Amino acid sequence: GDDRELAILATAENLLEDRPLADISVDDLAKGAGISRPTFYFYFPSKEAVLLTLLDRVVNQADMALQTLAENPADTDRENMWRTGINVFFETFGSHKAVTRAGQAARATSVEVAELWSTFMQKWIAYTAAVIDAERDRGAAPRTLPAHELATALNLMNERTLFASFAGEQPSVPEARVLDTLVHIWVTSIYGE
Amino acid sequence: GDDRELAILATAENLLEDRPLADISVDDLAKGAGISRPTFYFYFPSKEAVLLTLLDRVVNQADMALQTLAENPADTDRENMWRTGINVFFETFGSHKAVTRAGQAARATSVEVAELWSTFMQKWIAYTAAVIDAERDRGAAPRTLPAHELATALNLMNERTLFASFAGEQPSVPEARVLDTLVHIWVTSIYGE
Ligand SMILES: CC1CCN(C(=O)Nc2ccc(O)cc2)CC1
Ligand SMILES: CC1CCN(C(=O)Nc2ccc(O)cc2)CC1
C-alpha cells in the first residue's frame, strides 16, 4: 500500500533523470511500479501529483536538515557557519537533480508547486534574517540593510544560482565552484560595510 | 508595413498587461492592430513570435543603454558606478513589466526565447567580469573569487530578484527597496574580503 506509493515515487524520480514529466506517461509510471493504470489512480490523481509529492519530500528533507543544524551549533567561524548551512541545500537538491529540475519547471503550471516552494522560501528567508539579526545583536555584523530584505535577495540568488549550476545552464557557475561562490557573497554582504 | 508590424507589437504589449499570452488570440492581436488574421500571418508566424520580438526589443534597449554608460564614465564613487549600471536594468525591465513577465515565462517553452536571454546574460556577465578585473588591476578591488564566477552569481541574483520584485512574488524584495538591496550585495562582494 504505502509500498506501492513508494514504488510509484521511485519510478517517477528514475524516469525524470532521462526525460521531462511531459514525456512520461501514467502507463510508464504504473509499469515501472509493477501495478496497473487504474491501481495507479488509487494512489495519485495524475503524474503531476506524483511530482508534487517528490518535490514535497525533497523540500522537507532540506528543511529538516536545516532544523538539525539550527539545534546543533557546529563549533566554527562565521564563514563556516554559513557554508554548512548553504551546503544543506547544495547537497539535498544536488542529490535530487531530476526532481529539482522538474519541480522548478512545474512552478509555472502548478499552483500547488508554486505555493510549496513559496512557503518554504518564506521559512528559509525568515530563518536567515533571524540569524543575521542575532549576529547584529551580538556585535558581529554591522546594521546595514534591513535584514529581511538582504535575506530575501541572498535566498533568491541561491535558488537561481544552484538550479542553474545543477541544470548545467549557460550561463552558470560550475557545480564544483558554486558553494565557494555563494559563501563569499553571503559573508561579504552580511559582515561588510 | 513597418507600421502594421509596430501596431501588432504595441497591441501585444498592451494585452499582456491584462492577461498571459495563452489567453491572447491572434484574433485579439489582429483586431487591436486593425488588420485581418491573414494579414497578421504576413508579419508574424504566431503570437509566440510577437513575444520573441517584444523581448528582443527590451533586451536590446537594456544592452544599448549599458553600452552608452560604458562609453560615458559617470564621475562618481565605486558604489554609484555599480548603482547606475544596475539601474539600467531596473528601469528598462521595470518600464516593460508585462513583456518581462511573459518573456521569462516563455524561456521554458521557446528555444529562441531561452537562447536570446542566454546570449545577453553571457554578454552582461562578461562585461561585469571585465569591470571587476579593471577594478582589481587598478588596486581598488581585492583578488578574491574568480571574477567571471562572481559576475555570474551576481547577474543571476539580479535576474531572479528583479523579476520577483516586478511580479510582486511572495517572497520578493519590495520594488522600492530592490535597487539598494542589490547595490549593497554587489559592492560588498566585489570590494570586500
Ligand atoms: C540559514 C540559511 C543557510 C543558507 N540557506 C540557503 O542556502 N537557502 C537556499 C538555498 C537554495 C535554494 O533553492 C533556496 C534557498 C538559507 C538558510
Ligand atoms: C556592469 C553591470 C551592471 C549591472 N548589471 C546587472 O544589473 N545585470 C542584470 C540585471 C537584470 C537582469 O535580469 C540580468 C542581469 C550587469 C552589468
Curated annotation (Swiss-Prot), chains A, B:
SUPFAM superfamilies to which the protein is assigned, alphabetical: Homeodomain-like, Tetracyclin repressor-like, C-terminal domain
Superkingdom per UniProt: Bacteria
Function (record text): Involved in the repression of the monooxygenase EthA which is responsible of the formation of the active metabolite of ethionamide (ETH).
Disulfide bonds: none
Species of origin: Mycobacterium tuberculosis (strain ATCC 25618 / H37Rv)
Site features described as Inhibitor-binding, chain residue numbers: 155, 158
Effect of gene knockout: Cells lacking this gene leads to ETH hypersentivity.
DNA-binding span(s): 25-44
Name of protein: HTH-type transcriptional regulator EthR
Biological processes annotated in GO: negative regulation of DNA-templated transcription; regulation of DNA-templated transcription; response to antibiotic
Domain HTH tetR-type: 2-62
Gene3D superfamilies: Homeodomain-like (1.10.10.60), Tetracycline Repressor, domain 2 (1.10.357.10)
Annotated keywords: DNA-binding, Repressor, Transcription, Transcription regulation
PROSITE patterns in UniProt: HTH_TETR_2
Binding partners and assembly: Homodimer.
Matching PANTHER family: HTH-TYPE TRANSCRIPTIONAL REGULATOR ETHR (PTHR30055:SF184), HTH-TYPE TRANSCRIPTIONAL REGULATOR RUTR (PTHR30055)
A Pfam family this chain is assigned to: TetR_N
Miscellaneous note of the record: Binding of inhibitors to EthR induces a conformational change in this repressor, which is then unable to bind its DNA operator, consequently allowing for increased transcription of EthA and bioactivation of ethionamide (ETH).
GO-annotated molecular function: DNA-binding transcription factor activity; transcription cis-regulatory region binding
Activity: how regulated: Inhibited by tert-butyl 4-(3-thiophen-2-yl-1,2,4-oxadiazol-5-yl) piperidine-1-carboxylate (RF1) and 1-(thiophen-2-ylacetyl)-4-(3-thiophen-2-yl-1,2,4-oxadiazol-5-yl)piperidine (RF3).
Gene Ontology cellular-component terms listed: cytosol
